[PDB]
């Protein structure tokens, strides 16, 4: 139905909903590849949960469309660009602005975490801004989505546990990345410098980083707790939400969403 | 300046001309402060000196070292040929025999370095280089020890990196260097990375598993060598000796020969920087 524009399995073409004349980005994918997948059921569940998710900081997926060969996911279009574009214009950002933004991210992540969903590839590409300027997080519950001369990063955030190549607590992983994002906003670089990869990994494993001088002591403390390499000893979302630095000028959003709509919808999600 | 007329600027590498002989070189220029006050000043010294003394047709040469009260200057052979992988872009895969040539050169070079007691620690395409003649030459050998080598723009692939390295702890350098050669060889032949770059956490999963799917066009013996090289276990990973003995590796191969003096008085090595 959508008046689609343009544009290996994730050609996110632009489009518009003709009937309400609104244009929303569509992530398109081979129907086959997904439906056969170890995570297929989780994909369905995660897709369905989010589909019903409604939060000021989370980019929404309006609808899922089905084809014989392809699946179309309909996702809100955020013009405000990437937040880190804003950083690049300025280098680092201010404590206050940064805290406003970090709070938003944490709240959105908490919301997603509450519904049993984890990101697992939380990075700045995902960080986005709505026209009014609010943070919308993206690719949430989309990570499970199946899978030359130039390859661009960055695996800097990738939590140590992931480095192991085994199993990781999703929440612990997401928070770790959240720690890094916070770090980049304030400091205007990555806590662990990319150029030397083996050394980068050693640094990540040791959690040894160069703090900037301008970071206040608390922020540093919060970051150390966020950037614990050990998932068991690392801070909880709850823990950080109750932080002294985090707490400042804080205010809790509260959403009003449907209790998870009939799974029947979930089973019928793809056909 | 100190025999050299410097240009600008490719850590900061710069183009330079050796005036006295009137020949041309690239120079790495860095602060004295950063190098001397590093956990690894001693290792840096040893390896640097070894390189200065090394001489091999496939290894980018370290002519000499210049020291200032404020900074350290490293002179290196200049190669016009550029990245080998540019060649891959043109024709996708390289052919089996040619790929074998290059692999022979790379293995020879690494082996020579390894014998001399030095390990690369960061073998990636940037380092693989070509000369006017079309021969391969390998850079940043003995410079991984170099401090903090070298924002949004990042051009690093972790695919080559060995798994043990992934941990962030300890490994024998050689096994890691062998792993990269394994990846390097694979990419040449196949015209892609063994493990998909995207979905990085799954990417790391693949690497630690050492799960990769060879193309059909790969011959059985090459597959064997790749499999043996791409052992996620570094105690069960093939040594340079093994790979040199390997069948597919044996084919048409001829040991390179070069002459360098026994490592010049370390006293020189300690006096390298002052």
Swiss-Prot record, chain A:
Induction: Up-regulated in roots by salt stress.
UniProt subcellular location: Cytoplasm; Nucleus
Family: Belongs to the protein kinase superfamily. CAMK Ser/Thr protein kinase family. SNF1 subfamily.
Region of interest: Activation loop: 139-161
Modification Phosphoserine, positions: 143
Residues at which ATP binds: 27
Protein known as: CBL-interacting serine/threonine-protein kinase 24
Curated annotation (Swiss-Prot), chain B:
Residue sites binding ATP per the record: 28
Source superkingdom: Eukaryota
Limits of the Protein kinase domain: 4-249
Modification sites for Phosphothreonine: 153
Cofactor: Mn(2+)
Residue span relative to the full protein: 8 to 289 of 446
Catalytic reactions of this protein: L-seryl-[protein] + ATP = O-phospho-L-seryl-[protein] + ADP + H(+); L-threonyl-[protein] + ATP = O-phospho-L-threonyl-[protein] + ADP + H(+)
Cellular compartments per GO CC: nucleus; plant-type vacuole membrane
Region of interest (Activation loop), residue spans: 140-164
Record protein name field: CBL-interacting serine/threonine-protein kinase 24
Subcellular location(s) of the protein: Cytoplasm; Nucleus
Main location group: cytoplasm
An annotated Gene Ontology molecular function: protein kinase activity
Quaternary context: Interacts with CBL1, CBL2, CBL4/SOS3, CBL5, CBL9, CBL10 and with the protein phosphatase 2C ABI2.
Class of the enzyme per the UniProt entry, highest EC level: transferase
């Amino acid at each position: 139905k959508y008046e689609v524009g343009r544009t290996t399995f994730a050609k996110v073409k632009f489009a518009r909903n003709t009937d309400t004349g609104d244009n929303v980005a569509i992530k398109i994918m081979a129907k086959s590849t997904i439906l056969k997948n170890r995570m297929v059921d989780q994909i369905k569940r995660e897709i369905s949960i989010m589909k019903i998710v409604r939060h000021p900081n989370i980019v929404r997926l309006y609808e899922v469309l089905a084809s014989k060969s392809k699946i179309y996911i309909v996702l809100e279009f955020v013009t405000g660009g990437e937040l880190f574009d804003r950083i690049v214009h300025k280098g680092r950002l201010k404590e206050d602005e940064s805290r406003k933004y970090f709070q938003q991210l944490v709240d959105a992540v908490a919301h997603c975490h509450s519904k049993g969903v984890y990101h697992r590839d939380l990075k700045p590409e995902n960080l986005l801004l709505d026209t009014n300027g609010n943070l919308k997080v993206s690719d949430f519950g989309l990570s499970a989505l199946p899978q030359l001369n130039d390859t661009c990063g960055t695996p800097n955030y990738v939590a140590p546990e992931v480095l192991s190549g085994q199993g990781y607590d999703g929440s612990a992983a997401d928070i770790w990345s959240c720690g890094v994002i916070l770090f980049v906003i304030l400091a205007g670089y990555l806590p662990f410098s990319e150029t030397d990869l083996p050394g980068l990994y050693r640094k990540i494993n040791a959690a040894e980083f160069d703090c900037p001088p301008w970071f206040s002591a608390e922020v540093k403390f919060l970051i150390h707790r966020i950037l614990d390499p050990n998932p068991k000893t690392r801070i909880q979302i709850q823990g950080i939400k109750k932080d002294p630095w985090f707490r400042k000028n804080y205010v809790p959003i509260r959403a009003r969403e449907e209790e998870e709509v009939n799974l029947d919808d979930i089973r019928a999600v793809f056909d």
